[PDB]
Design a protein around this ligand. Structure first.
Ligand SMILES: *[C@@H]1O[C@H](CO)[C@@H](O[C@@H]2O[C@H](CO)[C@@H](O[C@@H]3O[C@H](CO[C@H]4O[C@H](CO)[C@@H](O)[C@H](O)[C@@H]4O)[C@@H](O)[C@H](O[C@H]4O[C@H](CO)[C@@H](O)[C@H](O)[C@@H]4O)[C@@H]3O)[C@H](O)[C@H]2NC(C)=O)[C@H](O)[C@H]1NC(C)=O
Ligand SMILES: *[C@@H]1O[C@H](CO)[C@@H](O[C@@H]2O[C@H](CO)[C@@H](O[C@@H]3O[C@H](CO[C@H]4O[C@H](CO)[C@@H](O)[C@H](O)[C@@H]4O)[C@@H](O)[C@H](O[C@H]4O[C@H](CO)[C@@H](O)[C@H](O)[C@@H]4O)[C@@H]3O)[C@H](O)[C@H]2NC(C)=O)[C@H](O)[C@H]1NC(C)=O
Ligand SMILES: *[C@@H]1O[C@H](CO)[C@@H](O[C@@H]2O[C@H](CO)[C@@H](O[C@@H]3O[C@H](CO)[C@@H](O)[C@H](O[C@H]4O[C@H](CO)[C@@H](O)[C@H](O)[C@@H]4O)[C@@H]3O)[C@H](O)[C@H]2NC(C)=O)[C@H](O)[C@H]1NC(C)=O
Ligand SMILES: *[C@@H]1O[C@H](CO)[C@@H](O[C@@H]2O[C@H](CO)[C@@H](O[C@@H]3O[C@H](CO)[C@@H](O)[C@H](O)[C@@H]3O)[C@H](O)[C@H]2NC(C)=O)[C@H](O)[C@H]1NC(C)=O
Ligand SMILES: *[C@@H]1O[C@H](CO)[C@@H](O[C@@H]2O[C@H](CO)[C@@H](O[C@@H]3O[C@H](CO)[C@@H](O)[C@H](O)[C@@H]3O)[C@H](O)[C@H]2NC(C)=O)[C@H](O)[C@H]1NC(C)=O
Ligand SMILES: *[C@@H]1O[C@H](CO)[C@@H](O[C@@H]2O[C@H](CO)[C@@H](O[C@@H]3O[C@H](CO)[C@@H](O)[C@H](O)[C@@H]3O)[C@H](O)[C@H]2NC(C)=O)[C@H](O)[C@H]1NC(C)=O
Ligand SMILES: *[C@@H]1O[C@H](CO)[C@@H](O[C@@H]2O[C@H](CO)[C@@H](O)[C@H](O)[C@H]2NC(C)=O)[C@H](O)[C@H]1NC(C)=O
Ligand SMILES: *[C@@H]1O[C@H](CO)[C@@H](O[C@@H]2O[C@H](CO)[C@@H](O)[C@H](O)[C@H]2NC(C)=O)[C@H](O)[C@H]1NC(C)=O
Ligand SMILES: *[C@@H]1O[C@H](CO)[C@@H](O[C@@H]2O[C@H](CO)[C@@H](O)[C@H](O)[C@H]2NC(C)=O)[C@H](O)[C@H]1NC(C)=O
Ligand SMILES: *[C@@H]1O[C@H](CO)[C@@H](O[C@@H]2O[C@H](CO)[C@@H](O)[C@H](O)[C@H]2NC(C)=O)[C@H](O)[C@H]1NC(C)=O
Ligand SMILES: *[C@@H]1O[C@H](CO)[C@@H](O[C@@H]2O[C@H](CO)[C@@H](O)[C@H](O)[C@H]2NC(C)=O)[C@H](O)[C@H]1NC(C)=O
Ligand SMILES: *[C@@H]1O[C@H](CO)[C@@H](O[C@@H]2O[C@H](CO)[C@@H](O)[C@H](O)[C@H]2NC(C)=O)[C@H](O)[C@H]1NC(C)=O
Ligand SMILES: *[C@@H]1O[C@H](CO)[C@@H](O[C@@H]2O[C@H](CO)[C@@H](O)[C@H](O)[C@H]2NC(C)=O)[C@H](O)[C@H]1NC(C)=O
Ligand SMILES: *[C@@H]1O[C@H](CO)[C@@H](O[C@@H]2O[C@H](CO)[C@@H](O)[C@H](O)[C@H]2NC(C)=O)[C@H](O)[C@H]1NC(C)=O
Ligand SMILES: *[C@@H]1O[C@H](CO)[C@@H](O)[C@H](O)[C@H]1NC(C)=O
Ligand SMILES: *[C@@H]1O[C@H](CO)[C@@H](O)[C@H](O)[C@H]1NC(C)=O
Ligand SMILES: *[C@@H]1O[C@H](CO)[C@@H](O)[C@H](O)[C@H]1NC(C)=O
Ligand SMILES: *[C@@H]1O[C@H](CO)[C@@H](O)[C@H](O)[C@H]1NC(C)=O
Ligand SMILES: *[C@@H]1O[C@H](CO)[C@@H](O)[C@H](O)[C@H]1NC(C)=O
Lengths: 132, 102, 453, 112, 128, 132, 48, 48
């Protein structure tokens, strides 16, 4: 029939698959990220650590150009000193966990580059809107 | 006072058949309970709130009806079910109908 | 046209029934009295002015007060903060000594019995070596006989050694405004004709309830929330005999309870910094503590509740009253608090009449008990200390807690009887207007627009 | 392997009386995406099986209210409300929640 | 489980007064009512009255007032707080009162009145 | 004068009114949704339940096309098996509480339909942006 | 399955976990009637 | 490490140290953790 349990995977379902098939379904890891007298305080400090580290990822996402769009292009070019890999491989050769080792030095340079490339784009949108 | 009247008196049947038990109240808009008492044993509950069942009662016991009429229909009569059956509303009991073998 | 599309709507008024934890709102005027002279005046939240009681036109809502929550939560936490005010107070273990008690100095007639016992005993001083010989006074409902001579002991000394109550704190009721947390509303039924269940066709939304007084009376509810127009009676199935009939009447009946012994206090020292307050001499006369209601007022109020009771049991029904056939001392009596001491009265001059369909005061002889076992927990009691001077309070009887009599005969009479029982039935006379709903926004409705690309 | 049992074996139904065919899985069939992955199929003898009820308590694009789906976790009932002459055939219960797909043993309904 | 154990059978004289224990065990005794049902031959069942055993608030039948009295005894120890015992002093007997006496209890059922009694006692027959 | 207390209602003000007059003012139920030693823990577990169930509604809203727009069209058609009602009635005949009973079976089918209709629209926006 | 840290070490235990269970039947055959001694107010002490 | 003490040029700010807070909070909690270090310690009643 229509609707089967084969290609409709679950949480962390495509965790070994290639990036071109992991970016097909990103919402399944997205929605299970917030919901799911001293052992009540083990409940409190487990809950306010979940809603805190969710908001921290929604803030670093927020101050770039991506409010809730969940996939978004940007303006910074890709300097080959970061990864030096071909484009035609890294969407069907590697997998995401193999990528996260391959780049982990160069984050906080990209995250610093993204904020300035947004705030430069933000006021330049205003200067276009101000003259007209 | 609420008075309860049981209809059939002695209802004699054979095992495997299906018996009905009709009990008539005198005040509409209430619940009903059906008590089964065997010969020389402690009585047990079957029905409360005219439809539900007690803990550990087979699903051949079913009761229905509202207003002033209340039925207790037993499907697939066993040999143990030939007992006296009692109505009960709030404190008042029926005089009890009897089930006998044929 | 027919190509209808989903459009979501965030922030949209709908609700479902739910139940979550509510909190206090003590009134801000009661904050001047310093550092918990009553329980929960610094602990929970200062209130707001002018709570936005706003109407909800063209709204009907299915209320309920018997399967209602928040009268279950109110019984839960009031038990708990009663235990919060006893953990600082002094444990009263070293008072379990074999007492030696005689009659109090009084004109002992054979008809009367001794209400107050003398009970001189031994108790350690602040030094661990010496043992002073001190005396006190004790009620007869606090000593039992160890069985020549006559030597008693405390009644709670079997199975439950239990604390004193610090005389800094006070057992007076202050108002408590229950408030819903963020995301929850409290619907309030404004209907002037509203029994227990049933759709209330005139509701209103608040955020904090009106001032509830937590009192503890078993029969004869006190000091709270009179009705609008008539005398409303309300129950579960009224042809049931185990569900109480919470009568709540319209004009208040003023009660005038007192205790005329002077009852001078004195402080016995248990050990290092642990005082124990015992009643010493009594100055004046040994008189019985009583209560008064006006006979012209009370009989007129029973004339009201015997009319509304005939609406459920028909006319020409000879309604009579009786005096709570049996039970413990705290249910056969009108048990309440007054100024910090615990009166147990005797409502048997009140609930004694018979009614057919065609200036002086009633005195109720009360009696006082010092140890207190409210809510009947297994290993607790609470020795309330004595208080100085004549004690007098004035309260409004607002509602009764009746109970029908489970007949099985073809009689006409229906002998109603008072009975306290569970302490929740007091707070169901205050929390029947309020239910708590959960605001559930983010609805969805079809209309004719599509997200253009 | 998960077991799909079908009750009863065969039913001789009158045209008009509500008929019920029940099937029970080995575990619950509710998935996190929001659909219950229990299905029901109609097969005539000498004819390929056709889907009747997908995503139960919702009808398909071409079947009327003569078929119905209801139940809960591990308990699935197919209800045939109004019986026609074309209602005869063998019905199958089948899960599309997990791999593999397991089918029912078959419930024959005939005419009287 | 819930178990209600009664007392044994007695032989009394007209004018005496029985006392029928009913020892409850297996549930918290401070919560649920205990009723008392008398079963007479040729009359069916007959109610007597309940006892709410938290405080001990009782209420009898209309035609049995002045002749019945129900007390209770709780369990005042935190090592075993579930058990308890209800009583019944049926005073002023008669040869027309010889019957079987049952102590019952409602079911922990929550859609369920006080009167649909689930667990019953073993039954005590009293001969006059 | 200008500015009166008649049509400027309060919290849950139009709760019995029709949908065409309830969607006029949705912000009043929106803004009173977050703000307004053991009874401090009754304060803590009342606060972190309020900020948690607010973020849960802001996440289910977020992964559809509606970041904070508070009224937004979408792309899924309205199958008449859900409601089968006319359009011309349900904006001036019914009210919102009468609607919530009329549809409550069919949620979590709509909420599952909305996520896939966004993520299909999300990557198709990228494939349009990638070729040019 | 046997499993450890460095198996040529002598201070790290070898947690053997075997496949079929071996049923043990431990008992204590004294009857050992209890009784309650009362320490004070509401403090029982259970001694054999 | 190295707390970011960073200057605020062209900034004046009206300080106060007598109606200042956080010397009231510092007196409050230092009383309280002085009581935290005495609840494990031994009560000295039988020395009287
Ligand atoms: C709550 O309040 C009610 C109302 O007061 C109390 O009920 C009263 O209880 C007292 C005590 O039992 C009752 O007093 C007794 O009354 C008996 C009947 O009195 C009539 O008969 C005598 C002669 O027998 C006449 O002189 C009298 O005028 C009446 O016509 C008396 O017989 C009793 O006296 C006997 O006992 C006492 C004590 O041993 C002796 O001193 C006497 O000499 C005599 O031997 C006694 O007087 C009173 O009647 C009750 N009121 C009623 C029934 O309306 C409740 O007790 C109270 N609640 C609690 C828990 O106590
Ligand atoms: C004392 O009085 C109270 C109220 O005054 C009575 O309580 C009501 O009793 C009735 C009947 O027992 C209850 O009705 C039952 O409701 C169940 C739950 O339904 C809920 O949801 C529906 C739909 O939203 C609501 O309309 C409803 O109010 C409930 O909130 C149903 O499951 C029941 O149906 C079952 O039983 C009937 C009859 O047996 C069958 O026909 C059905 O097919 C099904 O098997 C039934 O409808 C009602 O909920 C109770 N509460 C209230 C507040 O009204 C007591 O019964 C009464 N007690 C005595 C001893 O007299
Ligand atoms: C029903 O409501 C009425 C409301 O009037 C209530 O009656 C009042 O109760 C309060 C306290 O319960 C009484 O207030 C007392 O009044 C005396 C005389 O003025 C004061 O001395 C008292 O102070 C005592 O407590 C202080 C703190 O503990 C001590 O420091 C001080 O030395 C005193 O010991 C206290 O303020 C008031 O007199 C009555 N009456 C009136 C007319 O207000 C009644 O109690 C309520 N009923 C119930 C059952 O709760
Ligand atoms: C409870 O019983 C005690 C024990 O008897 C009573 O206390 C004692 O009462 C007597 C008689 O009043 C006192 O004796 C008198 O003392 C004064 C002063 O010393 C003396 O001048 C008199 O000649 C007489 O001897 C006694 O002091 C007093 N206290 C003690 C410790 O013995 C007590 O009065 C009784 N309770 C009540 C409420 O009366
Ligand atoms: C409700 O009112 C009735 C009156 O009809 C009260 O009954 C009376 O109760 C008192 C005390 O319980 C009885 O006095 C004593 O009786 C015992 C024997 O039971 C005897 O040993 C004593 O010497 C004394 O006489 C009184 O006789 C009794 N009267 C009747 C007619 O029953 C009842 O107590 C009231 N209930 C409450 C809770 O106050
Ligand atoms: C409960 O109600 C009954 C019925 O009204 C009361 O019984 C009656 O009480 C009065 C007052 O005591 C009795 O009056 C008699 O008056 C004469 C002269 O004053 C006096 O000599 C008698 O000793 C008696 O007081 C009346 O006979 C009596 N009736 C009956 C049938 O007993 C009862 O008093 C009420 N209960 C309470 C606590 O008030
Ligand atoms: C309080 O303590 C005193 C001091 O021991 C007790 O007095 C003695 O009690 C014993 C035991 O009964 C007697 O054999 C002595 O003769 C008593 N001596 C004196 C001087 O009285 C006293 O019994 C204790 N209890 C009370 C109530 O006073
Ligand atoms: C604890 O002590 C109390 C006080 O004596 C006991 O209560 C009395 O016990 C006797 C037993 O001979 C009874 O005759 C009395 O009727 C009881 N008094 C009351 C007011 O009921 C009690 O039995 C003791 N034990 C427990 C477990 O509480
Ligand atoms: C509380 O009021 C409601 C509404 O008036 C009552 O509900 C109905 O009352 C009538 C009166 O006899 C009954 O015939 C109906 O069966 C009741 N239910 C419904 C759904 O209509 C309710 O009985 C009242 N309760 C009390 C204790 O008076
Ligand atoms: C209760 O007794 C006390 C104790 O005697 C009375 O208080 C005394 O009052 C007089 C004047 O009224 C003062 O001269 C005394 O100094 C007071 N004594 C104490 C110890 O305070 C009190 O008046 C009595 N109560 C009543 C209502 O008269
Ligand atoms: C209860 O006591 C209060 C005050 O002690 C009484 O109220 C007084 O009543 C008299 C008589 O009419 C009036 O002269 C006073 O002005 C009232 N004072 C106040 C403050 O109200 C009340 O009447 C008593 N009630 C009963 C039933 O005894
Ligand atoms: C007892 O009853 C009296 C009389 O109704 C209450 O006095 C009323 O209090 C309210 C509260 O503000 C006023 O609005 C009324 O005007 C008062 N009426 C009269 C006649 O004074 C009194 O509050 C009640 N409660 C207590 C504890 O005394
Ligand atoms: C657990 O298993 C692992 C993998 O089989 C073992 O790791 C290797 O074991 C061989 C066997 O001699 C060694 O030569 C290697 O040096 C080990 N390490 C690596 C990285 O290959 C490990 O020794 C086993 N542990 C135990 C306690 O048996
Ligand atoms: C352990 O000893 C107890 C105490 O005698 C035994 O319990 C008795 O059992 C008999 C019948 O089996 C009863 O008649 C007694 O009333 C019981 N006594 C008590 C105090 O309960 C028990 O049977 C013994 N254990 C075994 C395994 O036999
Ligand atoms: C990251 O940097 C460390 C040293 O700074 C280096 O050893 C490592 O190889 C780098 N990672 C990659 C993936 O090159
Ligand atoms: C003291 O109280 C008892 C209590 O029963 C009483 O019997 C006795 O008469 C009273 N008086 C005397 C002088 O003992
Ligand atoms: C009580 O009030 C009624 C009301 O009319 C009156 O008839 C009666 O005389 C009053 N007194 C009684 C019953 O003692
Ligand atoms: C009882 O009397 C009242 C008097 O107001 C009347 O309205 C009512 O109809 C009567 N009851 C019956 C059943 O007639
Ligand atoms: C929702 O489904 C239940 C059974 O699954 C059904 O009884 C009910 O009528 C449905 N709701 C609506 C609004 O049709």
């Amino acid at each position: 029939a229509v609707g089967i349990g084969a290609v409709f995977l679950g949480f962390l379902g495509a965790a070994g698959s290639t990036m071109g098939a992991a970016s097909m379904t990103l919402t399944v890891q997205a929605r299970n990220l917030l919901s799911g007298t001293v052992w009540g305080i083990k409940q409190l400090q487990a809950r306010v650590l979940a809603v805190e580290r969710y908001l921290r990822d929604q803030q670093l996402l927020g101050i770039w150009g991506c409010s809730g769009k969940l996939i978004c292009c940007t303006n910074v070019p890709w300097n080959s000193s970061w990864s030096n890999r071909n484009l035609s491989e890294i969407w069907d050769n590697m997998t995401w966990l193999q990528w996260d080792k391959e780049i982990s030095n160069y984050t906080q340079i990209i995250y610093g580059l993204l904020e300035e490339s947004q705030n430069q784009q933000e006021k330049n949108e205003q200067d276009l809107l101000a003259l007209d | 006072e609420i008075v309860l009247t049981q209809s059939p008196g002695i209802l004699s049947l054979s095992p495997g058949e299906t018996a009905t038990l009709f009990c008539k109240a005198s005040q509409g808009g209430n619940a009903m309970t059906w008590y089964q008492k065997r010969r020389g044993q402690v009585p047990r509950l079957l029905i409360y709130d005219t439809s539900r069942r007690a803990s550990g009662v087979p699903d051949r016991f079913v009761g229905s009806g509202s207003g002033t009429d209340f039925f207790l229909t037993i499907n697939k009569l066993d040999r143990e079910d030939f007992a006296v059956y009692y109505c009960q509303q709030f404190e008042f009991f029926g005089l009890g109908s009897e089930l006998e073998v044929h | 046209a027919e190509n209808l599309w989903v459009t979501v709507y965030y922030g949209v008024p709908v609700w479902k029934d739910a139940e979550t934890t509510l909190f206090c709102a003590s009134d801000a005027k009661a904050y001047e009295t310093e550092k918990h002279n009553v329980w929960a005046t610094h602990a929970c939240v200062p209130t707001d002015p002018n709570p936005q009681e706003i109407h909800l036109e063209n709204v009907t809502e299915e209320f309920n007060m018997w399967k209602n929550n928040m009268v279950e939560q109110m019984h839960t936490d009031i038990i708990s903060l009663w235990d919060q005010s006893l953990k600082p107070c002094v444990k009263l273990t070293p008072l379990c000594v074999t007492l030696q008690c005689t009659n109090v100095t009084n004109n002992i007639t054979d008809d009367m019995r001794g209400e107050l016992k003398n009970c001189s005993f031994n108790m350690t001083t602040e030094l661990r070596d010496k043992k002073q010989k001190v005396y006190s006074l004790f009620y007869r409902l606090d000593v039992v006989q160890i069985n020549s001579n006559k030597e008693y002991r405390l009644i709670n000394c079997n199975t439950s050694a239990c604390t004193q109550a610090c005389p800094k704190v006070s057992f007076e009721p202050i108002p408590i405004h229950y408030c819903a947390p963020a995301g929850f509303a409290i619907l309030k039924c404004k209907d002037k004709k509203f029994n227990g269940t049933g759709p209330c066709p005139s509701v209103s939304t608040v955020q904090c309830t009106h001032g509830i007084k937590p009192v503890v009376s078993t029969q004869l509810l006190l000091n709270g929330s009179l009705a609008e127009e008539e005398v409303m009676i309300r129950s579960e199935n009224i042809t049931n005999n185990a569900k109480n009939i919470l009568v709540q009447f319209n004009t208040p009946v003023q009660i005038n309870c007192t205790r005329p012994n002077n009852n001078t206090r004195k402080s016995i020292r248990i050990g290092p910094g642990q005082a124990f307050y015992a009643t010493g001499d009594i100055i004046g006369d040994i008189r019985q503590a009583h209560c008064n209601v006006s006979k012209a007022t009370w009989n007129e109020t029973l004339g009201k509740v015997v009319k509304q009771l005939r609406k459920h049991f028909g006319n020409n029904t000879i309604i009579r009253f009786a005096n709570s056939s049996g039970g413990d001392l705290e249910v056969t009596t009108h048990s309440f608090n007054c100024g910090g001491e615990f009166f147990y009265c005797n409502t048997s001059g009140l609930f004694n009449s018979t009614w057919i369909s065609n200036n002086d005061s009633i005195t109720l002889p009360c009696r006082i008990k010092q140890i207190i076992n409210m809510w009947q927990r297994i290993g607790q009691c609470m020795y309330a200390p004595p208080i100085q001077g004549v004690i007098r309070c004035v309260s409004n009887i607002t509602g009764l807690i009746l109970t029908r009599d489970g007949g099985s005969t073809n009689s006409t009479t229906e002998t109603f009887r008072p009975g306290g029982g569970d302490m929740r039935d007091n707070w169901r006379s205050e929390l029947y207007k309020y239910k708590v709903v959960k605001i559930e926004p983010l609805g969805v409705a079809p209309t004719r627009c599509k997200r253009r690309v | 392997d998960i077991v799909m049992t079908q009750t009863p074996l065969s039913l001789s139904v009158t045209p008009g009386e509500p008929a019920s065919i029940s099937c029970r899985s080995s575990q619950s069939l509710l998935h996190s995406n929001g659909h219950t992955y229990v299905h029901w199929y109609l097969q005539k003898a000498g004819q390929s099986p056709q889907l009747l009820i997908y995503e139960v308590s919702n009808r398909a694009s071409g079947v009327p209210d003569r078929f119905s789906g209801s139940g809960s976790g591990t308990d699935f009932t197919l209800k045939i409300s109004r019986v026609e002459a074309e209602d005869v055939g063998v019905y199958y219960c089948e899960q599309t929640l997990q791999i593999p797909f397991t089918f029912g043993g078959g419930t024959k309904v005939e005419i009287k | 489980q819930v178990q209600l154990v009664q007392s044994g059978a007695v032989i009394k004289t007209p004018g005496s007064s029985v006392k029928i224990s009913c020892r409850a065990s297996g549930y918290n005794f401070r919560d649920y009512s205990i009723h008392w049902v008398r079963l007479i031959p040729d009359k069916g069942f007959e109610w007597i009255g309940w006892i709410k055993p938290l405080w001990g608030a009782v209420s009898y039948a209309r035609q049995l007032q002045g002749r019945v009295s129900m007390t209770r005894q709780l369990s005042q120890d935190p090592d075993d707080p579930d058990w308890g015992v209800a009583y019944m002093e049926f005073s002023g007997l008669t040869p027309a009162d010889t019957a079987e006496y049952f102590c019952v209890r409602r079911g922990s059922c929550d859609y369920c009145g006080d009167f649909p009694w689930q667990y019953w006692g073993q039954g005590t027959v009293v001969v006059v």
